[PDB]
Amino acid sequence: DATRISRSDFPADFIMGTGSSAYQIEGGARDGGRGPSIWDTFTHRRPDMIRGGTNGDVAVDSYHLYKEDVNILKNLGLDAYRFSISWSRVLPGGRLSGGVNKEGINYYNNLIDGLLANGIKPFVTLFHWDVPQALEDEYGGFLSPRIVDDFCEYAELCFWEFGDRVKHWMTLNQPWTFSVHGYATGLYAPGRGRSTGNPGTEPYWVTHHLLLAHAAAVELYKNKFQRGQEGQIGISHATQWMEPWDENSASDVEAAARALDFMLGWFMEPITSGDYPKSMKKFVGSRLPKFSPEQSKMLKGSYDFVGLNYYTASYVTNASNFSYNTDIHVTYETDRNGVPIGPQSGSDWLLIYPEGIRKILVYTKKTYNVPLIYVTENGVDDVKNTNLTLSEARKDSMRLKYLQDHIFNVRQAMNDGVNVKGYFAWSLLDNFEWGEGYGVRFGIIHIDYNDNFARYPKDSAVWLMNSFHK
Ligand SMILES: OC[C@H]1O[C@@H](O)[C@H](O)[C@@H](O)[C@@H]1O
C-alpha cells in the first residue's frame, strides 16, 4: 500500500531531495554581472512564444531570496538539493576571454556554504539549456563543435571553485528536450526548425555536440579533479514510458522499442557502447553523424552514475520534407479503447501512470547495465486556478498521491534489482515553466506572485517532511 511509504522502507544511504534550474528560479538576470543566455533573448525578442508574454528577468527571485530557500530546505528535512549553475552568470561572455564574473562565483559559494551549514548535500548540474548568448551569436552555440572547448573551460572553472564542497556533478540535464524543442519543433530557445533551421539535420548535430561536450567534461573531471576532490560525475536524461498500443501486435512492440531508442537510446547508447542505436542509424541514415574512434573511446562509460527524469507514459503504434519527429515512424496514442493510459494532471500531455517509472528503471538497467541510478526529476503540476485563496490552493492532493505512487514504484524497481541511490522531486518551488510562463505550478512550495514571491509549503511538502525527514 502506497499511502504508508516512508523513509524506513528504504536503505539507510538512500538520498531524498528536490530540484530547480537556474533560469526557472534565479531572476537577477542582469544583476551581479550576469550576461544574457539564449533564454533571455528568446523570451525578450519573441514574447509571443511564451504564455502571457513573460520571462525570467525576476522569476521567483532566488538570486536575492536564496537564504529563504535554504531555510525552507532545512525545514523540509530532506538530504539533498539539486540545482544548476547559470553558465553566463559566472562567464558572461561564455568563454574565458569574455571575463570571469567573481560576483556570480560568490553567489554560488554562498548558496553552497548555506546548504552545507544546514546539512544539505548539493547536487549540481552544469547545464540546463541556458547557453550564453555570446557563444550562440559567435558560432551558433551547440550547432558548432567549438562549443566543446568552451563548455570544458566552463566546467573546469566550476570544479576549481566549488569541487572542494560539491561531490556530485551532472554535466547535462534533459538534453533531449533541448535538442528537440530547440531545433526540431522550435518551441523552446533558440526557436528554430520551422540559414533558418532544419528539423531534419540540426537536432542530430546539437545532440552530437551535447554528447561530445558531456564526454570531454567527464574526461576533464576524471583526469584532473577526481583524485584531489573525490567527487562523482554523471548526467540526467529525459524519459517517457513507451507502451505497445496492442500488447500482441509485434509491430507495436517494435514501435515502442524504437520510440525508446529515439528518446533515451539516442543519449544512452553513445555512453554505453560508443555508438548511436541500430534503429536510428537505419531510419536516419546518412543524416546521423558518426563518432571518430577517439570520440567513441571517450564516450564509452563516461559517467559514475546516471539520473533519470520521469513524468508520463504513452501507447505507441507504427506510422503509415525530413524531420526528427517523422524519423521515429511511430504514432502516439493516449487510450486503449476509450480508456486513457492514466488521468490528466493540470497539463494535457501529462498522464498519470506510476507503473511507468518502475518499467523505465528496469528497462534502463536491463538495456544499458547502469550500475548506479538516481531519479533526478519526477513530479506533476497543479490544475491552473487563479480563483483559489492560499488555504485552498495549497491542498495539493493530486501531487501528494502522485508522489506516493511514484515513490512506491521506485521501491518496487529496487526489489526488481535496480540499484537506485536516490530520488529528487521536481520541483522545490513553483517557477517559470518555459513556454508555459507562470501559469503551470510544479512546486511542493507555493509561490505568491502577487506578493513578492512569498513562499508557503503545500500539503505535499509537509508530507515529504513527515515521511522522509532525515
Ligand atoms: O514544464 C515542463 C518541464 O518543466 C521544467 O520544470 C522541467 O525542467 C522539465 O523537466 C519539465 O518537463
Side-chain angles (χ1 to χ4, degrees), residues 1-193 195-470:
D1 181 54
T3 332
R4 16 199 74 174
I5 195 79
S6 96
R7 176 168 303 268
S8 42
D9 311 325
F10 286 88
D13 62 331
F14 190 78
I15 273 149
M16 293 288 293
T18 45
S20 58
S21 71
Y23 189 77
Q24 299 181 272
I25 69 173
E26 285 181 8
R30 289 187 287 292
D31 294 335
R34 178 162 181 285
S37 81
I38 60 171
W39 274 99
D40 296 77
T41 297
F42 183 72
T43 57
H44 285 87
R45 296 178 186 167
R46 300 177 66 196
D48 57 274
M49 296 298 283
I50 314 291
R51 226 161 91 69
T54 52
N55 59 58
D57 285 352
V58 171
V60 298
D61 212 11
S62 297
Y63 181 68
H64 305 107
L65 295 180
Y66 78 89
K67 287 186 174 216
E68 273 183 52
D69 297 351
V70 171
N71 194 247
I72 291 173
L73 285 163
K74 182 264 291 173
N75 283 354
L76 184 58
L78 303 185
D79 314 271
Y81 177 52
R82 199 192 131 246
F83 64 87
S84 72
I85 293 170
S86 171
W87 193 337
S88 66
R89 191 174 298 286
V90 309
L91 294 169
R95 48 194 274 235
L96 291 188
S97 63
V100 174
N101 181 21
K102 18 215 25 166
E103 221 175 330
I105 293 157
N106 300 337
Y107 175 69
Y108 295 112
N109 269 328
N110 289 338
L111 175 61
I112 291 161
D113 296 338
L115 292 164
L116 293 174
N118 282 286
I120 304 148
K121 285 178 227 205
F123 278 53
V124 172
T125 298
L126 300 179
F127 173 74
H128 203 298
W129 317 346
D130 42 355
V131 186
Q133 189 65 39
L135 296 186
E136 181 77 10
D137 275 335
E138 187 187 350
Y139 58 64
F142 275 92
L143 282 178
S144 154
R146 295 187 51 191
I147 197 82
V148 167
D149 289 327
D150 291 340
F151 176 85
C152 283
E153 291 304 16
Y154 161 50
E156 178 158 25
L157 178 54
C158 298
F159 304 140
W160 172 254
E161 300 288 351
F162 313 121
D164 71 308
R165 277 99 76 232
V166 173
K167 307 315 198 188
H168 301 84
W169 296 97
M170 268 126 9
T171 48
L172 319 166
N173 188 57
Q174 273 211 269
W176 178 89
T177 309
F178 176 68
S179 191
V180 173
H181 285 295
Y183 296 92
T185 70
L187 288 168
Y188 281 10
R192 5 168 75 230
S195 133
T196 199
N198 182 341
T201 45
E202 281 184 8
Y204 295 102
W205 279 114
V206 167
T207 289
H208 190 70
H209 296 153
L210 289 155
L211 286 164
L212 285 175
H214 159 85
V218 165
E219 163 166 275
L220 197 169
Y221 185 75
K222 270 174 130 47
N223 292 340
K224 293 181 178 184
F225 286 92
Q226 185 154 44
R227 183 197 198 169
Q229 302 185 341
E230 297 176 340
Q232 289 179 325
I233 190 164
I235 185 164
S236 288
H237 290 305
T239 78
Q240 167 183 297
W241 184 253
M242 299 302 193
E243 193 57 23
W245 196 17
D246 177 331
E247 292 290 311
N248 307 128
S249 177
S251 158
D252 271 9
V253 164
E254 194 186 286
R258 174 195 328 140
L260 288 158
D261 269 356
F262 269 78
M263 202 179 59
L264 182 54
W266 198 9
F267 293 89
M268 272 310 287
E269 190 71 53
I271 77 187
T272 304
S273 58
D275 209 353
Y276 285 112
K278 259 185 168 315
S279 33
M280 252 186 302
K281 303 218 248 182
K282 185 144 100 68
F283 292 77
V284 195
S286 73
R287 282 175 303 115
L288 183 76
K290 303 166 142 175
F291 290 116
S292 82
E294 316 44 51
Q295 301 168 342
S296 267
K297 216 274 282 288
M298 210 190 287
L299 284 158
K300 197 201 200 150
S302 69
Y303 67 84
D304 293 312
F305 64 84
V306 173
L308 311 163
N309 306 329
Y310 175 103
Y311 297 90
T312 195
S314 95
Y315 300 117
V316 203
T317 203
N318 235 95
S320 58
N321 218 45
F322 296 108
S323 179
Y324 167 84
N325 298 310
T326 67
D327 295 328
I328 320 177
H329 292 106
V330 296
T331 293
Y332 294 116
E333 293 307 329
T334 66
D335 8 78
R336 234 171 209 173
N337 290 120
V339 194
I341 189 159
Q344 311 191 18
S345 74
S347 279
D348 54 28
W349 64 271
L350 200 173
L351 300 191
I352 300 173
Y353 182 80
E355 298 73 30
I357 203 158
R358 183 200 185 154
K359 295 186 171 164
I360 204 52
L361 282 166
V362 176
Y363 175 86
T364 303
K365 177 195 140 60
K366 230 152 69 95
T367 318
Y368 311 101
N369 333 333
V370 190
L372 216 81
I373 294 189
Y374 293 83
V375 173
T376 41
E377 294 189 6
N378 181 242
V380 68
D381 59 304
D382 299 326
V383 182
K384 334 189 171 8
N385 196 348
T386 69
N387 299 322
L388 301 182
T389 65
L390 177 59
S391 342
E392 309 166 287
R394 64 177 300 266
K395 280 157 189 303
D396 66 326
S397 17
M398 170 183 72
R399 178 172 296 103
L400 170 54
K401 190 182 157 37
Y402 183 110
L403 293 179
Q404 275 168 92
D405 293 349
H406 292 84
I407 287 165
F408 184 62
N409 280 101
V410 172
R411 194 40 190 114
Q412 297 296 65
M414 295 160 70
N415 289 334
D416 302 345
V418 188
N419 187 30
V420 178
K421 285 324 220 174
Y423 170 89
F424 291 80
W426 179 271
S427 64
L428 173 65
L429 304 175
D430 297 342
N431 51 224
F432 172 74
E433 294 284 344
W434 308 120
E436 300 278 42
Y438 301 95
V440 165
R441 291 179 183 270
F442 269 93
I444 70 178
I445 305 301
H446 184 272
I447 292 287
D448 184 348
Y449 295 100
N450 296 304
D451 184 27
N452 302 113
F453 321 104
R455 280 90 154 120
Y456 202 93
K458 288 178 198 175
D459 297 335
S460 53
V462 183
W463 174 80
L464 268 167
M465 181 276 294
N466 210 40
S467 309
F468 290 92
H469 199 290
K470 232 40 144 316

